[PDB]
Amino acid sequence: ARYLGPKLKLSRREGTDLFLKSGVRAIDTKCKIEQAPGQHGARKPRLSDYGVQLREKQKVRRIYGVLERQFRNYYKEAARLKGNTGENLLALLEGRLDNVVYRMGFGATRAEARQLVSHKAIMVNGRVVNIASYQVSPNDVVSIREKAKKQSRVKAALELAEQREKPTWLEVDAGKMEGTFKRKPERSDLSADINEHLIVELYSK
Amino acid sequence: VTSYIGGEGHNLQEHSVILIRGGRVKDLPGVRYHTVRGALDCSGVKDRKQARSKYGVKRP
Amino acid sequence: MVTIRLARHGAKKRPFYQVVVADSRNARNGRFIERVGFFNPIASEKEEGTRLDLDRIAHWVGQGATISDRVAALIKEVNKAA
Amino acid sequence: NIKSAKKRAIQSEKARKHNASRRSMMRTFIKKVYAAIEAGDKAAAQKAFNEMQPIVDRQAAKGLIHKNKAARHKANLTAQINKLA
Amino acid sequence: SKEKFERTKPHVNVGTIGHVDHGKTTLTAAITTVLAKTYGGAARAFNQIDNAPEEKARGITINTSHVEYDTPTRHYAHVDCPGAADYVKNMITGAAQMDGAILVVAATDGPMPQTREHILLGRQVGVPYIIVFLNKCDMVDDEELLELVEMEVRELLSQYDFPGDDTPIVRGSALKALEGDAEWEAKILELAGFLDSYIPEPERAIDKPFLLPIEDVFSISGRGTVVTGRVERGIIKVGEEVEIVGIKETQKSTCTGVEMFRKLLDEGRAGENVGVLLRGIKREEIERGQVLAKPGTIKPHTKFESEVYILSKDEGGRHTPFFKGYRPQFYFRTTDVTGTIELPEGVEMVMPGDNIKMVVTLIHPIAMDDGLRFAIREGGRTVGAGVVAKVLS
RNA sequence: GCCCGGAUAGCUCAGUCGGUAGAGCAGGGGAUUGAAAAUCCCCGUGUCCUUGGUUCGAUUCCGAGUCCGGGCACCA
RNA sequence: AAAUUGAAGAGUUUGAUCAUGGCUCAGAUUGAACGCUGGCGGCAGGCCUAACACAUGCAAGUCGAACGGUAACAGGAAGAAGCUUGCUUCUUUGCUGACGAGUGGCGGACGGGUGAGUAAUGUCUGGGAAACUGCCUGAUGGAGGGGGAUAACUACUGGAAACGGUAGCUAAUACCGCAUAACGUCGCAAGACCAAAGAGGGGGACCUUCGGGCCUCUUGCCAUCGGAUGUGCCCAGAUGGGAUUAGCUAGUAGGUGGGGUAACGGCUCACCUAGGCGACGAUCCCUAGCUGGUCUGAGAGGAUGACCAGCCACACUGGAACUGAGACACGGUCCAGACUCCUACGGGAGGCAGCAGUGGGGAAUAUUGCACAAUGGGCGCAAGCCUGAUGCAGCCAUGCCGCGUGUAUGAAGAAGGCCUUCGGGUUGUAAAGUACUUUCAGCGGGGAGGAAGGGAGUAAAGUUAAUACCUUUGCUCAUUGACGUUACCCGCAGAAGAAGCACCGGCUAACUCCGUGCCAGCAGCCGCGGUAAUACGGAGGGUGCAAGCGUUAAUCGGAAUUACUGGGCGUAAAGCGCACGCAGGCGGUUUGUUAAGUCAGAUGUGAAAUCCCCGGGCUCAACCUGGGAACUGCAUCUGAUACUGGCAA
Numbered sequence A: 001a002r003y004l005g006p007k008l009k010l011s012r013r014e015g016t017d018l019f020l021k022s023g024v025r026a027i028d029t030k031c032k033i034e035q036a037p038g039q040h041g042a043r044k045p046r047l048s049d050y051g052v053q054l055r056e057k058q059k060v061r062r063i064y065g066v067l068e069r070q071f072r073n074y075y076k077e078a079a080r081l082k083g084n085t086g087e088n089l090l091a092l093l094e095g096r097l098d099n100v101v102y103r104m105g106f107g108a109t110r111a112e113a114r115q116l117v118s119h120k121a122i123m124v125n126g127r128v129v130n131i132a133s134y135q136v137s138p139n140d141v142v143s144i145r146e147k148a149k150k151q152s153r154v155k156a157a158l159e160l161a162e163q164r165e166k167p168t169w170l171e172v173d174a175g176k177m178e179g180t181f182k183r184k185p186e187r188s189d190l191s192a193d194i195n196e197h198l199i200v201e202l203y204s205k
Numbered sequence B: 001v002t003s004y005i006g007g008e009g010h011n012l013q014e015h016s017v018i019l020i021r022g023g024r025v026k027d028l029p030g031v032r033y034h035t036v037r038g039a040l041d042c043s044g045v046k047d048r049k050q051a052r053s054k055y056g057v058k059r060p
Numbered sequence C: 001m002v003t004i005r006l007a008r009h010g011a012k013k014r015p016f017y018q019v020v021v022a023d024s025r026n027a028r029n030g031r032f033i034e035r036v037g038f039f040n041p042i043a044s045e046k047e048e049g050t051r052l053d054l055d056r057i058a059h060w061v062g063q064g065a066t067i068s069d070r071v072a073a074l075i076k077e078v079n080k081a082a
Numbered sequence D: 001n002i003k004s005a006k007k008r009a010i011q012s013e014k015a016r017k018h019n020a021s022r023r024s025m026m027r028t029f030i031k032k033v034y035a036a037i038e039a040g041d042k043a044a045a046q047k048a049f050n051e052m053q054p055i056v057d058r059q060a061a062k063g064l065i066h067k068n069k070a071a072r073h074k075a076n077l078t079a080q081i082n083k084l085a
Numbered sequence E: 001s002k003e004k005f006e007r008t009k010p011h012v013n014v015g016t017i018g019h020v021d022h023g024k025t026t027l028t029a030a031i032t033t034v035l036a037k038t039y040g041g042a043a044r045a046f047n048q049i050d051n052a053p054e055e056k057a058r059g060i061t062i063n064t065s066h067v068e069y070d071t072p073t074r075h076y077a078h079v080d081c082p083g084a085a086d087y088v089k090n091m092i093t094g095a096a097q098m099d100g101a102i103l104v105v106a107a108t109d110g111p112m113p114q115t116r117e118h119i120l121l122g123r124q125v126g127v128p129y130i131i132v133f134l135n136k137c138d139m140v141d142d143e144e145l146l147e148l149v150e151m152e153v154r155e156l157l158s159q160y161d162f163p164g165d166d167t168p169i170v171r172g173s174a175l176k177a178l179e180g181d182a183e184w185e186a187k188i189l190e191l192a193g194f195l196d197s198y199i200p201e202p203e204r205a206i207d208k209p210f211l212l213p214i215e216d217v218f219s220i221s222g223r224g225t226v227v228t229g230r231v232e233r234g235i236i237k238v239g240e241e242v243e244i245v246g247i248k249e250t251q252k253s254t255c256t257g258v259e260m261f262r263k264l265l266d267e268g269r270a271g272e273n274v275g276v277l278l279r280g281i282k283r284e285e286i287e288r289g290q291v292l293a294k295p296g297t298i299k300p301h302t303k304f305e306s307e308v309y310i311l312s313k314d315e316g317g318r319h320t321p322f323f324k325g326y327r328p329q330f331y332f333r334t335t336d337v338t339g340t341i342e343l344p345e346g347v348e349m350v351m352p353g354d355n356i357k358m359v360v361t362l363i364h365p366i367a368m369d370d371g372l373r374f375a376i377r378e379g380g381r382t383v384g385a386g387v388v389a390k391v392l393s
Numbered sequence F: 001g002c003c004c005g006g007a008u009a010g011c012u013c014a015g016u017c018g019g020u021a022g023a024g025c026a027g028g029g030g031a032u033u034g035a036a037a038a039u040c041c042c043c044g045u046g047u048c049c050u051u052g053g054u055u056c057g058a059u060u061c062c063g064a065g066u067c068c069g070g071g072c073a074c075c076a
Numbered sequence G: 001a002a003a004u005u006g007a008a009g010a011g012u013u014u015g016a017u018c019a020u021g022g023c024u025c026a027g028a029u030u031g032a033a034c035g036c037u038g039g040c041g042g043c044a045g046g047c048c049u050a051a052c053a054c055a056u057g058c059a060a061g062u063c064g065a066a067c068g069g070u071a072a073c074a075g076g077a078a079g080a081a082g083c084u085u086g087c088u089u090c091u092u093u094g095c096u097g098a099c100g101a102g103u104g105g106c107g108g109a110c111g112g113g114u115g116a117g118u119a120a121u122g123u124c125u126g127g128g129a130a131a132c133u134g135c136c137u138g139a140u141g142g143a144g145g146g147g148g149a150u151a152a153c154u155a156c157u158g159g160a161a162a163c164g165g166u167a168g169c170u171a172a173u174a175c176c177g178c179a180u181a182a183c184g185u186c187g188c189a190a191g192a193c194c195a196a197a198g199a200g201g202g203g204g205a206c207c208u209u210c211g212g213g214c215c216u217c218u219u220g221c222c223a224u225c226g227g228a229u230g231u232g233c234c235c236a237g238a239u240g241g242g243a244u245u246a247g248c249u250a251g252u253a254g255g256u257g258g259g260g261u262a263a264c265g266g267c268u269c270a271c272c273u274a275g276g277c278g279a280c281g282a283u284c285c286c287u288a289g290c291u292g293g294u295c296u297g298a299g300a301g302g303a304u305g306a307c308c309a310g311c312c313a314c315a316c317u318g319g320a321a322c323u324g325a326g327a328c329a330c331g332g333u334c335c336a337g338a339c340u341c342c343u344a345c346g347g348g349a350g351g352c353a354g355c356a357g358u359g360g361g362g363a364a365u366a367u368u369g370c371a372c373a374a375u376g377g378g379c380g381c382a383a384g385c386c387u388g389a390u391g392c393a394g395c396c397a398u399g400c401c402g403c404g405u406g407u408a409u410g411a412a413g414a415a416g417g418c419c420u421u422c423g424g425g426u427u428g429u430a431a432a433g434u435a436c437u438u439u440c441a442g443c444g445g446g447g448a449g450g451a452a453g454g455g456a457g458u459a460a461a462g463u464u465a466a467u468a469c470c471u472u473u474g475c476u477c478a479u480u481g482a483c484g485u486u487a488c489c490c491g492c493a494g495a496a497g498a499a500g501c502a503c504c505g506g507c508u509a510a511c512u513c514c515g516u517g518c519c520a521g522c523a524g525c526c527g528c529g530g531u532a533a534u535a536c537g538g539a540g541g542g543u544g545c546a547a548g549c550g551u552u553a554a555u556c557g558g559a560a561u562u563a564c565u566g567g568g569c570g571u572a573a574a575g576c577g578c579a580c581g582c583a584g585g586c587g588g589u590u591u592g593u594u595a596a597g598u599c600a601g602a603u604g605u606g607a608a609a610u611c612c613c614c615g616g617g618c619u620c621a622a623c624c625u626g627g628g629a630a631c632u633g634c635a636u637c638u639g640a641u642a643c644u645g646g647c648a649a
């Protein structure tokens, strides 16, 4: 169901910073990033056309914390929806509750946001929700319950979110731990680096 | 028919009831099947660790 | 004898009755002439719940179709009751 | 057999003893008309037809004979009387 | 399997013991017709105790047959043993579950070699009490000859470590009580009184968790495979989880009906022979020797340390030394099993009549715990009793 | 539950009525030709299916077992 | 508003090449199986072979308002006998309520199960009728007088049993007269002919001969004519493969006449004619339930028809009918055969392709589950009682979906492993430790919604002679859950209980080395392995996938490698040796004329589910579900008549 392994190892293999081990400190400089995937990171890969696609797919999975079976289902939904197939893949991932909770600032990492969702802390439209893959509808109000409000893990994690870019599509109160998911996320608003194109190709064959 | 006994060593002899799966060897002309190691009287291969679903061996 | 009865569809522990005009001999879920609305017992206080097309009921009950114990009361529920 | 509604296995045995008797009675009275037809003028045939007409209609009403069976046994049989004699 | 067995009167597991062709099985036939006539229980006959081709053309019994005769005080449950030298293996299962035996020595022949072998197997396994019965009497019309046989039985029991003189010796012909002789019917009614008086109420273990050794597996065109045996400890409720442990490996199961001589039961209590029914198990895969335990209580083992007491010539056993590689038969609860011996360091040879511990690797695994009693046998005779010390596997 | 047969070095078989078991084919310390048809030398290379007993001494005589072969039964 | 956004290649012939062309692989799948590791929930699923043989419990009963029964049973009332005079014994009483048995009525033909047969009798769409239709219902109103008998019960026997006989006796809505008859049946019409059953809840008035005469109402019973409903038939096309099956066929093909069918018909007969089918595949052969759909595909197609739903077919194997509104009848009948059982050797029972269960054959596949609470379904005037229908309790990762085996910080870049150019690298922020949360499991307490009703009493409105009963509607009562220690909620304790198995030369993301030296083995293809291996075992980093993953079988895909969309035939496989020519396919050209094709429109229909879009509903999700589109149809009816055909000049 979850990875629960060495998280920063995934970032080296992929190369870029995946925000798995983001947390309290801003920058790591604490893994020999890029040049050490495993025992043979010095080996320059040839890297085929199937490779680059499969690396790009694994990047987007490992960022959002999703497995192949559930990720393949997002592609199937993304294809059936109107407009661009690539933009839908990412938009459906960004609409996940564990992703929204991370983007609100209620969690130093996305795994923390997932557990915070799982453990009955998160609540939306006056209803408790346990599911990380809960598709957050446009015009919703995610929030933390009064029992687990202002605990140790959340207040330190919300201060990290000030250093972050902060999305335009959602808004956060910050005083009373209350969020507001407004519109669906745009392509140009977020990332500007992870290529959807190559993921659309991989599943088509 | 004839069936190839995979792995190193075996407990098959004379009779002994064995389970047979499909799959040619591509070497022995005529042989077009494999004996499933682990199933029925055909025991697992002794001292195999990697790839033990094939060859029917338990945990270490 | 044609009769207006509930068909019972829906998942386990979550019934959804398809009130339907069928022959008495035919099975519960099987053969029918035409479906005439529905009933949802686990709908609760919200938007939808029970819908029953009363114009089609007059076409069969007026002719000669018996109404079952439940469908007779869902007529009593939709008309007046409140 | 493994039912208390076996009653119907006898009850129906009791039925056909009676049901064959009234049926056989009718078809003998119809045979009496067909016997009169062949070599007989407009007299003996219509007497036999006047006798069986009440008997065939009665058995039609009880559910032994269907009303169409009875209708033919008049229709085709009156034509034998009408055409020949 | 229709009438419900009402739990009234204490259950006691009785059985006949004695020489070959000594009126051992015929005693069981006499006890049924005598008790059923006067008191008013179920009748039965001498045929149903032993039919088949094997016990007709020959006449000799092999299978441990069972009988259920009732009395005012107690509800007895008979276990007729085979008796011959060839049938000692299936006898020990019948003799282990037996609480209080009925010895059968006869007034014409007297004590014989098997009688000594039977009582030898009774002590080491578990036979607390024993009662003598002279099973001929009428043939030799004499006062002095019949009474001289009674003396040698008192000698045998006292020589082999039983009460001997205290045991109530009874006389009576089995064939005479089968028909309807008023003097001989009353004399076997006296044996029923001796069973009540001498043998006390047996001590059960209805507290510590469920275990049941299997004596004989059936495939009842009924329900499925059925297993018979005395419940050694605990209870058996219907629709309860039961783990079958012993030979081969281990299999999960559930009880779906306990019974007592073709009659229904709710709770199969300890210390009584019951036919427990198993769900989803074939006739071949489950075999004799395995035990019906509660899940988690017992685990099958193929290696164990054990304090073995080897017997000498006087007690009845080996008379020569032996070294590692010796393979005798280890009789645990019901079945026997072969196993190689590995002696401790600083012990060159095991002399007869000696107390030592030793590791024993068995060829078949059997369910066992610390403090389990067993009796070693080899070559149609006993070798040494002992107890389990430590588990290894 | 009980009656019977079967097992001999890596494989296929000889040998026994107590005198301590051998043959080919095998294979190995073994030489030829980058490996080689034909060559040489060389060992048996052994829990006599396992274990105990009668015994000076058991493959061999007598119990008990192993797994496998085929045979006859019992229905809580 | 929307209703499709959907089309990848690679290895492999050669010294190298381009082509041709096979071979193999990457992805989807599933009634899967086995293998390895073996924690959860939700909605599903689960003998494909032997349509094999079956023990044990069950699966269709039900009605006292049809009637004898003064009752088998359990219990009140007039009276009796014991004696603790109300404690006990006990005969009468329709008399206490009901009901074992029985005739009756209506159900058992529906509802469940399985594909043996079936290549058309069947199935699909579209048609037509020449029909019947219990119970539902719209009219037309009758519904009057009788009489044998007949079980049960006796009585008396026969039989080992199953199951009878003979003598009475009696009951009914049972059963047959009877008068009675229509817009009914028959006839050219005049005529003739044709039916029924009473119950039950209540009653003022007057008959009481007390059985109550008699009025009310509710229901039954009839008579056709019409509904609605199923069912029977019939025609059109469609519905597998084979020509190494081209001839088949005598009730065969048609006619007249008789019989029979609910209905028409060689359905069946007698005679008459000599046909009929057939190259747009008869015949014979092999295989096969069919469909909605399912899987796959860019789509066309290809394959398939488990689960759910419609239709057919079959019930130990071959027959036949009886009864019925409906059967030529899964748990009716009677034969016949084979197979097990019982016996007094004479004759008897006998049907799991219901639901559990079992033995078998097998790669393989459930509980001798609990309940009518629920929607049905049966009978009933209602309560009811029956139900393996249905729901649901368990089992199995066989699956689909969603959860979890924590989530931050953490450098001495520790130890240990593995590699090394012995400098170090790597395992690795991995772990240890520090921040903490504590969804699931586990405990302890709250607790919905599936429940509509049914029942007992009340005020009124109908009904009527009547403030009575009856019918209807408000209104007060106490209740109805197999699931169920429920869904869901809240407190508790402490990361505590919680992992996978592939492969890693190439194709295909992933290599270092100790190698078992063409031995052991690998392998899906090319190929590896012969004292320095990314291709074998092993340790070991990863690569990869997750409660599953592999291997295997099976269908499609890629395969434009059966090509209609969409290939070819000089030399790669492939132009008959060359003509003539009927059937068939195609056909120059201008004016008419039709409307077959063709297109446009319209109406009917294309079952529901499924798919799709828009939605909604369960903590989200699978899942369920409201509403539209679609179902490449077909049918008709009316129009364009350019183009094709026909009929013209």
Ligand SMILES: Nc1nc2c(ncn2[C@@H]2O[C@H](COP(=O)(O)OP(=O)(O)OP(=O)(O)O)[C@@H](O)[C@H]2O)c(=O)[nH]1
Binding pocket: E019, E020, E021, E022, E023, E024, E025, E026, E027, E050, E059, E060, E061, E062, E081, E082, E083, E084, E135, E136, E137, E139, E172, E173, E174, E175, E176
């Ligand atoms: N004279 C006499 N003979 C008796 C009596 N009881 C039994 N028997 C005989 O003993 C025999 C019975 O032997 P059992 O030992 O009971 O039979 P069994 O147990 O099957 O025999 P095994 O199995 O060989 O021990 C019969 O043949 C009888 O004739 C008795 O009271 N008197």
Ligand SMILES: [Mg+2]
Binding pocket: none
């Ligand atoms: Mg999952």
Ligand SMILES: [Mg+2]
Binding pocket: A203, A204, A205
């Ligand atoms: Mg694709």
Ligand SMILES: [Mg+2]
Binding pocket: B022, B023, B024
């Ligand atoms: Mg293959």
Ligand SMILES: [Mg+2]
Binding pocket: B051
């Ligand atoms: Mg491999």
Ligand SMILES: [Mg+2]
Binding pocket: C044, G449
């Ligand atoms: Mg609610």
Ligand SMILES: [Mg+2]
Binding pocket: C069
């Ligand atoms: Mg009802």
Ligand SMILES: [Mg+2]
Binding pocket: none
């Ligand atoms: Mg006759």
Ligand SMILES: [Mg+2]
Binding pocket: D024, D028
């Ligand atoms: Mg006659």
Ligand SMILES: [Mg+2]
Binding pocket: D054
């Ligand atoms: Mg008349």
Ligand SMILES: [Mg+2]
Binding pocket: D063, D064, D065
């Ligand atoms: Mg009739």
Ligand SMILES: [Mg+2]
Binding pocket: none
């Ligand atoms: Mg449009």
Ligand SMILES: [Mg+2]
Binding pocket: none
């Ligand atoms: Mg696609």
Ligand SMILES: [Mg+2]
Binding pocket: none
């Ligand atoms: Mg080459």
Ligand SMILES: [Mg+2]
Binding pocket: none
């Ligand atoms: Mg060449």
Ligand SMILES: [Mg+2]
Binding pocket: none
């Ligand atoms: Mg499996």
